[PDB]
Motif scaffolding. Sequence first.
Motif, PDB file in Angstrom:
ATOM      1  N   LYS A  90      18.339 -23.053 -41.093  1.00  0.00           N
ATOM      2  CA  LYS A  90      18.740 -24.430 -41.347  1.00  0.00           C
ATOM      3  C   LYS A  90      18.345 -24.838 -42.726  1.00  0.00           C
ATOM      4  O   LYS A  90      18.821 -25.847 -43.214  1.00  0.00           O
ATOM      5  CB  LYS A  90      18.169 -25.391 -40.308  1.00  0.00           C
ATOM      6  N   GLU A 260      23.920 -16.530 -24.135  1.00  0.00           N
ATOM      7  CA  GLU A 260      24.804 -17.076 -25.161  1.00  0.00           C
ATOM      8  C   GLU A 260      25.084 -16.082 -26.274  1.00  0.00           C
ATOM      9  O   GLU A 260      26.208 -16.003 -26.768  1.00  0.00           O
ATOM     10  CB  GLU A 260      24.169 -18.290 -25.818  1.00  0.00           C
TER      11      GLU A 260
ATOM     12  N   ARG B   1      29.709 -22.445 -28.806  1.00  0.00           N
ATOM     13  CA  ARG B   1      29.319 -23.095 -27.566  1.00  0.00           C
ATOM     14  C   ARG B   1      29.347 -22.072 -26.460  1.00  0.00           C
ATOM     15  O   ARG B   1      30.372 -21.867 -25.823  1.00  0.00           O
ATOM     16  CB  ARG B   1      30.218 -24.297 -27.254  1.00  0.00           C
ATOM     17  N   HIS B   2      28.208 -21.425 -26.256  1.00  0.00           N
ATOM     18  CA  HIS B   2      27.042 -21.648 -27.109  1.00  0.00           C
ATOM     19  C   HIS B   2      26.293 -22.941 -27.084  1.00  0.00           C
ATOM     20  O   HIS B   2      26.055 -23.548 -28.128  1.00  0.00           O
ATOM     21  CB  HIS B   2      27.331 -21.268 -28.524  1.00  0.00           C
ATOM     22  N   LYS B   3      25.832 -23.347 -25.920  1.00  0.00           N
ATOM     23  CA  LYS B   3      25.245 -24.688 -25.775  1.00  0.00           C
ATOM     24  C   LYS B   3      23.841 -24.827 -26.380  1.00  0.00           C
ATOM     25  O   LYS B   3      23.572 -25.810 -27.070  1.00  0.00           O
ATOM     26  CB  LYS B   3      25.269 -25.183 -24.313  1.00  0.00           C
ATOM     27  N   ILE B   4      22.953 -23.862 -26.144  1.00  0.00           N
ATOM     28  CA  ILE B   4      21.578 -23.935 -26.686  1.00  0.00           C
ATOM     29  C   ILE B   4      21.454 -23.871 -28.215  1.00  0.00           C
ATOM     30  O   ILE B   4      20.824 -24.743 -28.819  1.00  0.00           O
ATOM     31  CB  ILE B   4      20.672 -22.899 -26.053  1.00  0.00           C
ATOM     32  N   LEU B   5      22.038 -22.852 -28.846  1.00  0.00           N
ATOM     33  CA  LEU B   5      22.341 -22.944 -30.274  1.00  0.00           C
ATOM     34  C   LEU B   5      23.336 -24.072 -30.354  1.00  0.00           C
ATOM     35  O   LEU B   5      24.294 -24.111 -29.565  1.00  0.00           O
ATOM     36  CB  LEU B   5      23.036 -21.680 -30.769  1.00  0.00           C
ATOM     37  N   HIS B   6      23.141 -24.996 -31.286  1.00  0.00           N
ATOM     38  CA  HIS B   6      23.933 -26.218 -31.269  1.00  0.00           C
ATOM     39  C   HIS B   6      22.923 -27.274 -31.197  1.00  0.00           C
ATOM     40  O   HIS B   6      22.783 -28.058 -32.123  1.00  0.00           O
ATOM     41  CB  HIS B   6      24.718 -26.308 -29.978  1.00  0.00           C
ATOM     42  N   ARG B   7      22.206 -27.297 -30.069  1.00  0.00           N
ATOM     43  CA  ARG B   7      21.126 -28.257 -29.879  1.00  0.00           C
ATOM     44  C   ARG B   7      20.053 -27.898 -30.879  1.00  0.00           C
ATOM     45  O   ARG B   7      19.530 -28.778 -31.579  1.00  0.00           O
ATOM     46  CB  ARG B   7      20.584 -28.244 -28.441  1.00  0.00           C
ATOM     47  N   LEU B   8      19.770 -26.592 -30.975  1.00  0.00           N
ATOM     48  CA  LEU B   8      18.846 -26.060 -31.979  1.00  0.00           C
ATOM     49  C   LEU B   8      19.403 -26.255 -33.375  1.00  0.00           C
ATOM     50  O   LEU B   8      18.655 -26.309 -34.342  1.00  0.00           O
ATOM     51  CB  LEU B   8      18.579 -24.568 -31.755  1.00  0.00           C
ATOM     52  N   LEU B   9      20.723 -26.342 -33.479  1.00  0.00           N
ATOM     53  CA  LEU B   9      21.349 -26.600 -34.773  1.00  0.00           C
ATOM     54  C   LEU B   9      21.385 -28.081 -35.105  1.00  0.00           C
ATOM     55  O   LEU B   9      21.097 -28.460 -36.235  1.00  0.00           O
ATOM     56  CB  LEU B   9      22.746 -25.996 -34.841  1.00  0.00           C
ATOM     57  N   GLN B  10      21.732 -28.903 -34.113  1.00  0.00           N
ATOM     58  CA  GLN B  10      21.777 -30.356 -34.258  1.00  0.00           C
ATOM     59  C   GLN B  10      20.439 -30.953 -34.709  1.00  0.00           C
ATOM     60  O   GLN B  10      20.428 -31.904 -35.496  1.00  0.00           O
ATOM     61  CB  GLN B  10      22.293 -31.012 -32.973  1.00  0.00           C
ATOM     62  N   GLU B  11      19.332 -30.393 -34.214  1.00  0.00           N
ATOM     63  CA  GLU B  11      17.983 -30.654 -34.751  1.00  0.00           C
ATOM     64  C   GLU B  11      16.918 -29.815 -34.043  1.00  0.00           C
ATOM     65  O   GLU B  11      16.023 -29.256 -34.685  1.00  0.00           O
ATOM     66  CB  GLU B  11      17.606 -32.142 -34.682  1.00  0.00           C
TER      67      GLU B  11
END
Lengths: 265, 11
Positions: A90, A260, B1-11
């Motif tokens: 990030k 995932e 999606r990939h739901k967990i990466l995403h949340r980890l990406l969002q913050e």
Amino acid sequence: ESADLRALAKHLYDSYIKSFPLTKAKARAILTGKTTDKSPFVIYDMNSLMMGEDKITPLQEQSKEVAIRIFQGCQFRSVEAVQEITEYAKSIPGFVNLDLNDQVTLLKYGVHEIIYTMLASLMNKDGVLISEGQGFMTREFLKSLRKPFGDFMEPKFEFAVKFNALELDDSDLAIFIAVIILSGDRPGLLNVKPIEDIQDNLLQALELQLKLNHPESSQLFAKLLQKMTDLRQIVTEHVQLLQVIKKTETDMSLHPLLQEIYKDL
Amino acid sequence: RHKILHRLLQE
Ligand SMILES: C[C@H](CCC(=O)O)C[C@H](C)C[C@H](C)C(=O)CC(=O)[C@H](C)C[C@H](C)C/C=C\[C@@H](C)[C@@H](O)[C@@H](C)[C@@H](O)C[C@@H]1CC[C@@](C)([C@H]2CC[C@@](C)([C@@H](C)O)O2)O1
């Protein structure tokens, strides 16, 4: 250019130091006995497994067989690494400005190559630092593991030996790790071009880093570029093990984060 | 999606 190449070289290190609690510097310090104030338990058989076993993997426990206990620490430790790497990612200049799907894509594919790069920092000829370095598992004991597992790490120790011979440091590794992540040839990327401009800047920062930090390795850059593709071998090897524990090897559910990731590659 | 990466990406 070559001052912002130094600038970006430093940023990464800072963020590398922020995101990764175990560093090569610590791993190397412990491996060579330089902190006799952190002298590590040695697991060399089933017998010392037991005693080192007593140092999350909760009441999720059940003393099952050796290999399922080892599955679970791997799994838990993979989850953490995914998180660190992601947080590190990030922080690569421009990384966040990319399309979300492609930021996901780079992590999907970049994550195991970096897990295995970092693993090398924990390895020498005879074994591997584990449990944040409070532990050391022998190569020989990883060989006594049955079924699909006994000869899995052998090609990783070879290569962990070959790649450590490059005497890379934490500041070197930082940029190498960002180069890997910013690679535009991952299946399914939507916008390849912006990634490549990012990778090219990193490739150059690295080039400089290596000439600077190691002026007497002449061709270190080229040696290090090649490891990137040994890394993908390492990884398809990985992927093909998950495969055998998908079908055979009841009882070994992947963590959903790891699900995932290992899904469609 | 990939739901967990995403949340980890969002913050
Ligand atoms: C150092 C490791 C044990 C340490 C521990 O018991 O704790 C050696 C460990 C046996 C490594 C290999 C996977 C092994 O033989 C696995 C094994 O029988 C079980 C049955 C199958 C697998 C869990 C299936 C799922 C995931 C694993 C394959 C995967 O996990 C590993 C290949 C890979 O991940 C290598 C290692 C293990 C996890 C890790 C991310 C950890 C280790 C420390 C740190 C900070 C380094 C590495 O960056 O990350 O890298």
